Amino acid sequence: TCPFYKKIPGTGFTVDAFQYGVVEGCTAYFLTHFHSDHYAGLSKHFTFPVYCSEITGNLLKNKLHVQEQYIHPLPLDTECIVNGVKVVLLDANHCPGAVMILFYLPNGTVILHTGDFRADPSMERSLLADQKVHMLYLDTTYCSPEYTFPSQQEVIRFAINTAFEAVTLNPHALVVCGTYSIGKEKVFLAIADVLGSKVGMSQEKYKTLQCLNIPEINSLITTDMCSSLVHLLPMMQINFKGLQSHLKKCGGKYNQILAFRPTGWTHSNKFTRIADVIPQTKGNISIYGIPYSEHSSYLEMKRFVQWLKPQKIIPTVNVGTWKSRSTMEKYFREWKLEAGY
Numbered sequence: 001t002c003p004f005y006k007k008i009p010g011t012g013f014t015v016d017a018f019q020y021g022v023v024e025g026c027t028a029y030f031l032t033h034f035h036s037d038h039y040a041g042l043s044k045h046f047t048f049p050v051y052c053s054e055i056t057g058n059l060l061k062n063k064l065h066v067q068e069q070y071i072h073p074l075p076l077d078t079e080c081i082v083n084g085v086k087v088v089l090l091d092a093n094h095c096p097g098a099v100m101i102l103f104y105l106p107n108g109t110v111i112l113h114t115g116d117f118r119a120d121p122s123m124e125r126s127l128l129a130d131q132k133v134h135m136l137y138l139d140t141t142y143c144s145p146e147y148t149f150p151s152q153q154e155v156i157r158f159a160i161n162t163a164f165e166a167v168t169l170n171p172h173a174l175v176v177c178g179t180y181s182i183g184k185e186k187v188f189l190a191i192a193d194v195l196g197s198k199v200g201m202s203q204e205k206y207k208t209l210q211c212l213n214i215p216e217i218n219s220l221i222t223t224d225m226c227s228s229l230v231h232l233l234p235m236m237q238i239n240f241k242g243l244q245s246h247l248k249k250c251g252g253k254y255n256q257i258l259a260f261r262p263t264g265w266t267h268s269n270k271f272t273r274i275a276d277v278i279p280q281t282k283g284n285i286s287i288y289g290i291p292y293s294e295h296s297s298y299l300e301m302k303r304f305v306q307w308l309k310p311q312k313i314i315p316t317v318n319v320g321t322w323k324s325r326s327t328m329e330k331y332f333r334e335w336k337l338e339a340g341y
């Protein structure tokens with residue numbers, strides 16, 4: 001059954017609630033972003049209104065074949081009315097098209113549901129600065145102090161230099177990058193840009209990326225593997241067996257693979273700096289695990305909540321265990337006591 005943290009009090013609304021059949025009482029389904037845990041359930045046969053960003057709209061139309069009449073795309077940073085309720089979509093600094101939703105309830109309450117997000121200080125100067133927020137439905141994926149990780153800028157620096165170095169030393173070397181959902185495009189796009197190649201991918205993934213309103217994207221991507229020396233693969237195929245295999249498919253055009261796995265957090269972050277990361281190497285194949293996150297670090301999250309000063313916090317990730325729930329309320333109370341709200 002639809003859980004309580006996917007319903008919006010005093011509205012006919014749910015968020016990211018497509019895997020529970022018809023929800024008793026819902027007049028509008030919101031979808032924060034196109035990642036399968038959140039869209040799970042949607043298909044061409046869905047006949048209720050869905051609300052979302054223009055980019056999430058393009059993917060529902062083209063990848064899930066949802067009928068155009070049930071897709072209601074909204075512009076960001078703009079006050080719109082949905083079944084008599086003022087709402088605003090804001091950028092979530094997660095994957096392309098990913099949004100936060102502000103709900104202005106008829107009774108005077110104000111609610112912010114973050115979807116998935118990576119908190120930034122730039123958010124402190126959106127339409128969020130203009131008014132109080134009473135409830136915050138918060139992406140809590142990394143709500144624990146051991147969760148540190150570097151900036152996206154630092155990580156893209158690392159990958160660029162690494163890639164450019166290896167290829168200038170050995171021009172017959174192939175760069176491979178893993179993927180399974182949208183998001184983190186900057187990794188492979190930045191490597192291809194410094195190398196002067198487009199990014200070879202499967203047709204299904206070229207179709208995915210074509211839906212994203214990226215600037216000049218035609219110039220950056222291709223389905224022609226042979227012309228390209230930066231290749232996308234499934235994240236499943238990024239291991240020694242899968243790379244030796246793919247290497248053979250290229251027909252003696254390359255002798256060395258340098259591959260990147262963008263992970264979220266990994267326990268080498270508690271000890272190691274980004275500058276000191278090393279690969280796993282078996283012969284002519286090396287694999288880099290890089291901590292590119294599109295989710296708030298503990299500090300980034302902490303900062304955002306203490307600036308927002310909400311009256312109630314309702315977690316949306318790591319809610320399935322009592323130890324987790326308990327631990328998260330402990331940090332919330334600390335943040336509150338430390339900041340005085």
Ligand code: NI
Pocket residue numbers: 033035094116
């Ligand atoms: Ni997500």
